[PDB]
Design a protein around this ligand. Sequence first.
Ligand SMILES: Cc1cc2nc3c(=O)[nH]c(=O)nc-3n(C[C@H](O)[C@H](O)[C@H](O)COP(=O)(O)OP(=O)(O)OC[C@H]3O[C@@H](n4cnc5c(N)ncnc54)[C@H](O)[C@@H]3O)c2cc1C
Ligand SMILES: Cc1cc2nc3c(=O)[nH]c(=O)nc-3n(C[C@H](O)[C@H](O)[C@H](O)COP(=O)(O)OP(=O)(O)OC[C@H]3O[C@@H](n4cnc5c(N)ncnc54)[C@H](O)[C@@H]3O)c2cc1C
Lengths: 379, 364
Amino acid sequence: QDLKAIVVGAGVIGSSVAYRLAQGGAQVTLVEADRVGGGTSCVSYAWVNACEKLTSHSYYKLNYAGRQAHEAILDEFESPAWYHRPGVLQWQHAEAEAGGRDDNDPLDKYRQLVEWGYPAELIDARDVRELEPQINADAIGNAPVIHYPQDGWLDPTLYAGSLTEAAMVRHGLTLVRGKVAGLVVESGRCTGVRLDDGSVLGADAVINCSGRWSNETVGEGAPHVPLAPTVGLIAYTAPAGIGLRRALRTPLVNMRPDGAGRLLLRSNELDQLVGNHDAPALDHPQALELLRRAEATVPALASVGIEAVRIAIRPIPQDSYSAVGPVPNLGNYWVAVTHSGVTLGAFIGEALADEVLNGRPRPELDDFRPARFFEQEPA
Amino acid sequence: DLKAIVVGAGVIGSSVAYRLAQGGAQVTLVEADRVGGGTSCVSYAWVNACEKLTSHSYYKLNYAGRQAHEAILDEFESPAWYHRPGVLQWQHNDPLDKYRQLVEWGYPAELIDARDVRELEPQINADAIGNAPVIHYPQDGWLDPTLYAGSLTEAAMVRHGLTLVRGKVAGLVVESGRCTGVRLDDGSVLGADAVINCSGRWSNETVGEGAPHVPLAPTVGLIAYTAPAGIGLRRALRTPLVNMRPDGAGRLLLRSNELDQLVGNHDAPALDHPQALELLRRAEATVPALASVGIEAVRIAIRPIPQDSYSAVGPVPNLGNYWVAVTHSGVTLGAFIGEALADEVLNGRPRPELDDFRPARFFE
Ligand SMILES: Cc1cc2nc3c(=O)[nH]c(=O)nc-3n(C[C@H](O)[C@H](O)[C@H](O)COP(=O)(O)OP(=O)(O)OC[C@H]3O[C@@H](n4cnc5c(N)ncnc54)[C@H](O)[C@@H]3O)c2cc1C
Ligand SMILES: Cc1cc2nc3c(=O)[nH]c(=O)nc-3n(C[C@H](O)[C@H](O)[C@H](O)COP(=O)(O)OP(=O)(O)OC[C@H]3O[C@@H](n4cnc5c(N)ncnc54)[C@H](O)[C@@H]3O)c2cc1C
């Protein structure tokens, strides 16, 4: 009786899809070529947010539903330690994780945030140090800073590991360490996956959650979602003897606590100087510059060094927006590939579980289906 | 107003400086490297009163340290440095004897078995436990001592005017048998009414040739830190093969007393250090879901003394206005030592809980 579902990829998205499918009664096989949470989800600022999406109201609403889903799922776990919400401070001219530099006036931006219901407040530049006194007074500038007091970041690898553990223990999910090389397709319907050893894993549904590898996973077996990948480098300090509670997104650097005093540092500007295949050396020129910018922002960081550097590729559909759903003329197959995948992961899990188990697409995804990239009329 | 110099900005010095500044002293905190950058940065940091049980007096001191770490949280906004998901502990002296002693003294501990662990942490390999009894400390956890030290130092500066000096103390300034300040390695002098040496394993090196020394028996410790791991583990584990616990965003901290015996004092903390690689293997044997997770960091530190009974926390007899703090369970005791030594310096009231740690006991 039970529907057999294969989820390819165990990142923040695939772990969510697999967990909700298994909870929904499906017999789930999660196929992961590397390790649970070891892909781009391991190299992310991971701000769970809708406030970076003020141009598309429907994309804002999708990201807001993702944010709400991350709060709701915590109730299903014991002592979940993966969603830290101490607040986020965002400057005018800050770079966005979703892309670009935001030069809009903070008061105009705040009016829109209020109208769209996002929890936020403004802080005068001269009052920022009341919240975080170790910020350099010379680094703050003169414009108001947006404070998202209930916002924070995910630990996507810990999240993915916890959901996979629960899916296995509570709902009989199986984890397969293997690399999908293509799909098995019979009469226009996908009937399973083929691994790179030629072995076949049969299923009633296949959900491709392989991130920036989305098209390489299916090869010639499925239509491709056009992608526009970019590289990201993140530097992680040794544990730092500073008091910083909140995430900081200044015109110079994006930085935040990442556990036990460690700091995560990144910059869109510096990403442009990183090659796709650069070695993540601890003395990488952009990692060293990230540390310099962090110390200029918080001078109390003196003598704290870089302990880790990670590099990954962003899954980004060609038009910037999520692609979650079926593709033309291939039954029993779904794909999920998107930027802001941390924000959206939990919601994508419940949305695709509803589609696979009950044939019920969520209305929030209406503007974000893969079909928009293909022919709209019969050829 | 009393002028106090605290040397060393680890978990102990930051606590002493914080409570002294809170108490009205003008505090100068002198740190040669960085706040929280010493042994406090390389610690399992279990806040506990159950390791290496000896006397009820030693338990009461460690328990007061544990309670002080909970109480201090109320003085800070959203403190993120004390994680209490529970601790699980099993061996291959006797664990029942230890469990019974802890229950009799009132410590929150429970005796469970491998089937109970399967419910709490299902990704632990049952083979790693066997039929051994398991002690669960359900309200216990660990500190982030570097984040703690940085937060207390920030608060002391903002709220109470503490000054932080990046400098290396080379000796004490003494006038007619009384300490009147410190001398830095550039020859400059910082004067004060009281000096509290909280330089950890560097305690004797800090004061140099013209000041008293306390006994030390140093040993080396290595800790390996994994990249973020896709496992669900909530609790800290203390097992026969490895002590391992979450350390942030999925990272795991790994260490072992047995493997520490094979580490040299000046070993480079290489990511492929032979004992770091063996720690990773033992961690995967304990939690097989750790497959393909690698080592991301390795840190090495020196412990000044191997057991709590070697500790020297209090005034030093042959020199006035001078205190020292050398501990074994420095994370557990840090907050309490802060309030205890602040009380001595400000009010001349030595806490009786520190009586067994008096440095004067080493001088006849
Ligand atoms: C620097 C940076 C900062 C970011 N900041 C944010 C932020 O603040 N907020 C936000 O919401 N998003 C942010 N993101 C985006 C977010 O991190 C990603 O969108 C998200 O992690 C993608 O998740 P995923 O599960 O789709 O991909 P992944 O985590 O990469 O998971 C895909 C998995 O598929 C596996 N796989 C691949 N090919 C195969 C195969 N053939 N067979 C089997 N398994 C396979 C891989 O091993 C991998 O584990 C950021 C991204 C970057 C790079
Ligand atoms: C592997 C390991 C595991 C541990 N696990 C636990 C545990 O589970 N529970 C527990 O309670 N404890 C534990 N401990 C013990 C605990 O970590 C230490 O006792 C504690 O961190 C010591 O703090 P401290 O402030 O005294 O020393 P430190 O943190 O070393 O601080 C001393 C400071 O003095 C500075 N300094 C040195 N010389 C000078 C100078 N001349 N001038 C100025 N500054 C100077 C140094 O730079 C340093 O920052 C563990 C220790 C180790 C090594």
